[PDB]
Symmetry: C3
Amino acid sequence: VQIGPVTDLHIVNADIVPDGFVRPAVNAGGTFPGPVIAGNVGDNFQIVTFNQLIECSMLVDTSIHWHGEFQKGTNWADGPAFITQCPIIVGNSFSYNFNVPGMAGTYWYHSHLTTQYCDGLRGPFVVYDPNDPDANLYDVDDDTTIITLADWYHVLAKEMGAGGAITADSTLIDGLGRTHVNVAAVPLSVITVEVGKRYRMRLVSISCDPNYDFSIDGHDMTIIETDGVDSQELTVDEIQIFAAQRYSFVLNANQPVGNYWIRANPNSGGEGFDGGINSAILRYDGATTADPVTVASTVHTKCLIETDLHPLSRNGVPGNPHQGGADCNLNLSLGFACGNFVINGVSFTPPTVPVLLQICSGANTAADLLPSGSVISLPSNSTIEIALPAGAAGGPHPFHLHGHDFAVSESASNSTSNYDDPIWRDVVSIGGVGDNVTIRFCTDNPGPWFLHCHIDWHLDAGFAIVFAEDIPNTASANPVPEAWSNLCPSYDSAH
Amino acid sequence: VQIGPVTDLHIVNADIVPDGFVRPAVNAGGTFPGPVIAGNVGDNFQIVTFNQLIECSMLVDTSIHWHGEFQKGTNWADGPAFITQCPIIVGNSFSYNFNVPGMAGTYWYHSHLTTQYCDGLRGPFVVYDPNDPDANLYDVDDDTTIITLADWYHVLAKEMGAGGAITADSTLIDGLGRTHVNVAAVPLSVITVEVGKRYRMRLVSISCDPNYDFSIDGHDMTIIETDGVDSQELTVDEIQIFAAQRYSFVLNANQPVGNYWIRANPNSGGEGFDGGINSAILRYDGATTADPVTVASTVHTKCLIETDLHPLSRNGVPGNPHQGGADCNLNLSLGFACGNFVINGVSFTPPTVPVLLQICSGANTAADLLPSGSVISLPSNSTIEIALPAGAAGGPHPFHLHGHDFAVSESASNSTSNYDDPIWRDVVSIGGVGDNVTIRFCTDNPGPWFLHCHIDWHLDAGFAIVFAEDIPNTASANPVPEAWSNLCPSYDSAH
Amino acid sequence: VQIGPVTDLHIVNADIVPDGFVRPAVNAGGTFPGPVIAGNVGDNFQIVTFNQLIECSMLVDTSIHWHGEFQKGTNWADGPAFITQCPIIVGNSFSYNFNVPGMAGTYWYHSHLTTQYCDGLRGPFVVYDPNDPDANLYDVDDDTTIITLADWYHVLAKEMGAGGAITADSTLIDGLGRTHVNVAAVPLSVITVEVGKRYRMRLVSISCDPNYDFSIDGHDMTIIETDGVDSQELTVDEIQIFAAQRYSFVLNANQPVGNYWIRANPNSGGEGFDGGINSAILRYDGATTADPVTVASTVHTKCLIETDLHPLSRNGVPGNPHQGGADCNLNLSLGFACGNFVINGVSFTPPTVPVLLQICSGANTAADLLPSGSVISLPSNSTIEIALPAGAAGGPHPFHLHGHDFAVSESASNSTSNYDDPIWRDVVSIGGVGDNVTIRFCTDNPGPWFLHCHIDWHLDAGFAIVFAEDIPNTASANPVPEAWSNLCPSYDSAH
Ligand SMILES: *[C@@H]1O[C@H](CO)[C@@H](O[C@@H]2O[C@H](CO)[C@@H](O)[C@H](O)[C@H]2NC(C)=O)[C@H](O)[C@H]1NC(C)=O
Ligand SMILES: *[C@@H]1O[C@H](CO)[C@@H](O[C@@H]2O[C@H](CO)[C@@H](O)[C@H](O)[C@H]2NC(C)=O)[C@H](O)[C@H]1NC(C)=O
Ligand SMILES: *[C@@H]1O[C@H](CO)[C@@H](O[C@@H]2O[C@H](CO)[C@@H](O)[C@H](O)[C@H]2NC(C)=O)[C@H](O)[C@H]1NC(C)=O
Ligand SMILES: *[C@@H]1O[C@H](CO)[C@@H](O[C@@H]2O[C@H](CO)[C@@H](O)[C@H](O)[C@H]2NC(C)=O)[C@H](O)[C@H]1NC(C)=O
Ligand SMILES: *[C@@H]1O[C@H](CO)[C@@H](O)[C@H](O)[C@H]1NC(C)=O
Ligand SMILES: [Cu+2]
Ligand SMILES: [Cu+2]
Ligand SMILES: [Cu+2]
Ligand SMILES: [Cu+2]
Ligand SMILES: [Cu+2]
Ligand SMILES: [Cu+2]
Ligand SMILES: [Cu+2]
Ligand SMILES: [Cu+2]
Ligand SMILES: [Cu+2]
Ligand SMILES: [Cu+2]
Ligand SMILES: [Cu+2]
Ligand SMILES: [Cu+2]
């Protein structure tokens, strides 16, 4: 079901049993996954978030991030607690009001307070484009062509465990899927197609942790979008999708009418598809309603490799075509030891005053911002290159940057850089020990933008810092509403 | 489950997944459908409604209607919000204390606040008859023979629609069914029978909108009751049942021990029975526990027609064996334009003071009453006749009158009136353009009686007017308890 | 999932549908059953119970008992409402803080307010012994090898009438099972085993009422533990387990790879296994994922007889070898009349002031303690014998004593006493008219200890007395935290 772009979104607690095991959840709009929030390019989004949360086992405060949306001019609507706002307290509401100029594709929203999105607050977010360059490549693009991949846990997020060393208890495709241990025969999701039709499947990883090896028996997948970035057509028979990433692929339903297994194997937890775990069903209209009996290819032949991807626009790459050919050029020491993650020797722990507020309240630099050693300023209007060399356990770590997308100049498991036509995206696997995954972008977006591993467990163990982009232009660039001013006083009073 | 006639009924929010899709709901008695409320003819019903609702997305006020109960002398207990009461606000309770003289059969209860009953607050209501004139036509008449047909939506009622055609997402029979799009193989309701026994099936439409074509593969159905009214035995192989109607039929379990599909095909929403949508299972004790493999008749051969129904008692018709032959005969103009329905040029919008309250406060005439043009007065001890010509989009509209049942002198799709032995009921389909459905009853029940289309979407869009019957005797006829008197000040103060 | 020995435990309302019928529940830790609370022998348990209950229909107060934990020194933490504490009110927490010296084995926890544990608040409690003498008898002992058996009702406990014979609507094994009437094909629990491994299976009855005949097609069970007491190895092929009892049994997975039914026939409610009621699935790794087609042995040849159990340690028996061979020997007259149970002519009805507070406020004798005639004082360091002659309306009644385990000197259906080597346990069936089931313990545990039938409906109808053990020393032995003292003032104020 789709909303808005002008919509109420209630946040409530409910018990759900997607794999047959009832446990409490945090829900956005009352469903798991949450409803699809949607509009067109350049629509004004006004999302009135009513916090009705009562079950403190999962926190009764909340804060919501719109994942992949630049929020230029509206950094205050971005969502990461203590980076851009204080949480909303229960009984209160907050209008997240923002535009999406110049963006279209497949995104998602989620809780961005501690590990709460694991406990259920996550759903798809799609910016349709009436003049979408890829539109003529399929027949159907609607709510029935969104595929969500979710890790699901029998253990309350607040009670793990971290880090960790945390594993899921099932994979849910479109909110349904079977339990890894003592698999009960619970309902599986169905995705229906009609012969001769072509489908823009919008694959959204709403994972708190694992990446999935995603494949559809008997069928190929032509990638056309990645993390909201339109791509040159690339046909693959399997896609490894890391936490928070999105792909749009054309499914051409050109196989005999019948039932085929939809497959999503995660890097951790249950291995295989016994009992129908890690599965959903692709069904042709007119097929017998039964489980598929198909098998995967013995060896997948055109597996997705990130260096095979290039933008549909001529995006090029900002800066100079050599290792470090950028203005401000960073290289981060990403580490782990004693149950905590570090970036440049510092584990992230949220400040009492949201970075955005510190800035709004007079901070000029840089050295003025809390937490010390967890904020890096970026000069206005500048090529930034970030190297994120791998090694820290574990891994592989999908890094994400708020308020931007970035050219992926060097991907995982391949030391050959690309300064011509690399894919731009917003979340990237930093690969394995030895790798030197590197990104470039331009600072056209004043404000504090979170940079973190997107494995939520590791974010909670402090794998993060803040790019405080153009500090001095941060207040003129982001006027805040009164209601945002009211957040931190309400929250501090409440706690 | 059965209660009362004396009972508590708590109204709460819960998420439920009747077709495998979790969403929020508004439940009476904590279950979907609500528990069966039951007692004997003549019983005093005492039903303490506790409002414990908190999810504002479906409204936290409520008001409950006991559909088909005449409510003589207890007009204040009727339930339609702003006609007979202000809603009960959350944290409060209200005793609906009323009696059922001279009524016995199959009824239901529902929220009668906005479209709240679509969100879950619907349940069967049954008045048993220790001397039921049909008791010897069956062996078993209990909670396991009640069959509810319900439309079910993935979109919250307050976010429809509207109007705006609106369509359901699954059919639920006894609270379970499978979704119309990307149907997941979720559990289906089973009804059990034993060879040689006869069952009073109490078929209840708790629908917000669609009518159903109901059938059981391999079985005939002998109708013995219509909307509370005992009928002569009419055997049919299909029953088209409109929103809010009820039928008791005898099922004779005379077939070979096995599994038989129960079928209920809505007039809008998913068509057919693929993957077991629009279906439940009739099982003989001793059958292999397996899905049925039966098929419906190619052509139904004794489909129910309303003119073939006749009261079991000689009821006759009030007034004159010709058209317009009543003390006080009305012909309503029923229209639709600009997303609203109108009755005699006026679209119903709820008053601020409930109609019963304005009467109790001095009001004397329809001119005196709010809403303006939305009230028609009726003189006491008269034969009313109401012609309800069809044609308004989008039929067919099931029109319902509170506080009464009526003789249907002219039915759908047939211009031949019947002033002899027409069936009496309380909810009648007005058919299609050209039809002139007409009803007669007698004014022996002072108070404000709602008259509306029972498609809830159409009622919220204005398809109603109020018959204020015997205004002058209303106050003395219906003494009100203090708790009713408190409802409006409490409600007004809350809002 | 496992939590503890130090943990939060939130008590919330949630609708659940374990047999496909949605209804309201009172949940501990958000699941049904509750999470397993675990620790090692000698550990300090600190369970913070957050009462977040809102649904009045099942009571918003609550109070938890740790069934079979002796609570020596901590009688205030025991949990029975109005015996050792007042209920925690909604919105408050309370810290159950206690140790388990000397004890190991399989226990459980539940609401001990009114009939609330029926409504969901139940879960297993395991004390692991790192030097368990039974360790070498098996390979696998963990959360996957706990098996709960639970009766489940469609009727909310508070509405059960009462008593009034009462019957469940399904049997749930590990929280899943099928309804007895109009059985829907809803998911069944699976217990997975690997060819050639031995399992410590922890069978726990969390029943409100029925006793189960428990068995596993094709397999033996070697009993090694009974209600916490290590036992000599006893191979049986069926186990009658009465409400609140526990057994650990070794299952040798020695049959061919396949699916085998696990059976739990309740002594009332649905009879047999038609459609998979009273059923769960034993699945071997490698078996096809399908319903077992196994059959129970026609006659079970080595079913559990309680007189066959002997302690593993040399517990022997206190006192002297003949009836009355104790310091303080009691014979309780157990009756039922007009819907209430009596113990020595008195029917238990909860006092306004909790028994332990009565003592703490300076009561010195049973005569001084309310309710009048519902208290029997015991002297310290004395051998107690309690005869519990059956005959009272159904029956068979499982009696349980708080703060103690006890030698079962005489078992049901067998009039021979055993004063050498009988099993010790904490819940015991008193059998049938004519029986004289007899227990013995020593009084080394100052405090008021509940003795009641563990059929909860029978407890609410009054089948209980309090053993006020060493009243003089009770206050000194049981120092209370301010929080406990805060309980009654809150409760009484709220009500
Ligand atoms: C049209 O409605 C009329 C009005 O009731 C129905 O008329 C009855 O039909 C049967 C046919 O023998 C007769 O027994 C009666 O004489 C008719 N009743 C009266 C009161 O005249 C007729 O059934 C309907 N037509 C159709 C085609 O269903
Ligand atoms: C439907 O039937 C009603 C009868 O109650 C008709 O009523 C009258 O019909 C005469 C025509 O002979 C006209 O004077 C009016 O149009 C009607 N008014 C009254 C008060 O009788 C009505 O005409 C019929 N209408 C339709 C739409 O079929
Ligand atoms: C069961 O056992 C008890 C004793 O353990 C029996 O109680 C005896 O009862 C008789 C008559 O009631 C008294 O004279 C004795 O004093 C009791 N003996 C003792 C030692 O107290 C009781 O009768 C038995 N009940 C049965 C068999 O129903
Ligand atoms: C009834 O109870 C008695 C008491 O335990 C059981 O008698 C024991 O029987 C075993 C072997 O049959 C002997 O080793 C013991 O000497 C008996 N013990 C005592 C203490 O007498 C008896 O077996 C039980 N009856 C049944 C049918 O099981
Ligand atoms: C990664 O590449 C960067 C280029 O900016 C280089 O400075 C650094 O030494 C490299 N580290 C590793 C581990 O390759
Ligand atoms: Cu994100
Ligand atoms: Cu983001
Ligand atoms: Cu990481
Ligand atoms: Cu983030
Ligand atoms: Cu109605
Ligand atoms: Cu009505
Ligand atoms: Cu209508
Ligand atoms: Cu109405
Ligand atoms: Cu207990
Ligand atoms: Cu106990
Ligand atoms: Cu009992
Ligand atoms: Cu107890």
